[PDB]
Ligand binder design. Sequence first.
Ligand code: CA
Length: 317
Amino acid sequence: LPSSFRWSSSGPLIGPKSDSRRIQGIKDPSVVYHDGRWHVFASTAKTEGYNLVYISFTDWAQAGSASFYYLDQAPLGTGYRAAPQVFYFAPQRLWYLVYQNGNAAYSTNPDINNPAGWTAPRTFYSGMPAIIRNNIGNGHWVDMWVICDSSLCHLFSSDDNGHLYRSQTSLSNFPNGFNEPVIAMQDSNKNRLFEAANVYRIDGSNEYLLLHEAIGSDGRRWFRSWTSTSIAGPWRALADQESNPFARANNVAFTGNAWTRDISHGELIRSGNDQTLPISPCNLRYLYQGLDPNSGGDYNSLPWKLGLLTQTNSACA
Ligand SMILES: [Ca+2]
């Protein structure tokens, strides 16, 4: 894995349908390739609220024409749900879909190909943990992420107030028994460590990669990166500055025209789909949300669309 990054971005690939729901943004994607298809889960976003959509397609060229399955038709149901993460929890032979609903929540499903199968929400905690209540400021408890190793499962989350939290439980007890979170990382400037963590095992190494979204000096979204030999840290900077970013307008080329100056809430294409959240160190690809740089107004009505970064300084195939 290199210590600097360069990317080539697609145009916008996935946006809202023109249906009566009048969704304004498609957001916060999670993605796996399974049995010959891409499976994308995303937030639907508008002034009126958030829920979740499932999108599947064979080929990236067909992403834009793929049908949506609105997950409020499954037991997962209506109400607020946002920012999904999908993975296969192999010990239970069950797919998990992790998201936020005011708490840290999850659904299960034996078959990712069955969007109607996602369960009504359960929560990982009985309420907001004390350490998060104490330090949230006037932020929001968001962006829930699970990663496991051979003995522990870890649940990360953000507060939009410069704290990354981490709880753990045993692999056998998952999804139950998550302990009181510790602050895994923090910054006194909430903009430097804002939300939307990703945490991955780097194949071929005994290291992990942390990505985290930030709001830069220009007001634009970007990603910082760190690595560690443990999911529990300590984290050391990889590409974590505006002049050496994980992903930002200044290291993102476009084959076409530059349609976004924001590189926001995304996910890397994985090398496998299980609860260890593995990535290859080669040919990194980042599925992310961007938007017209002239967009303004209420945050929830912003016209987010999904695009794909392909690494151009790749170390390997
Ligand atoms: Ca996410």
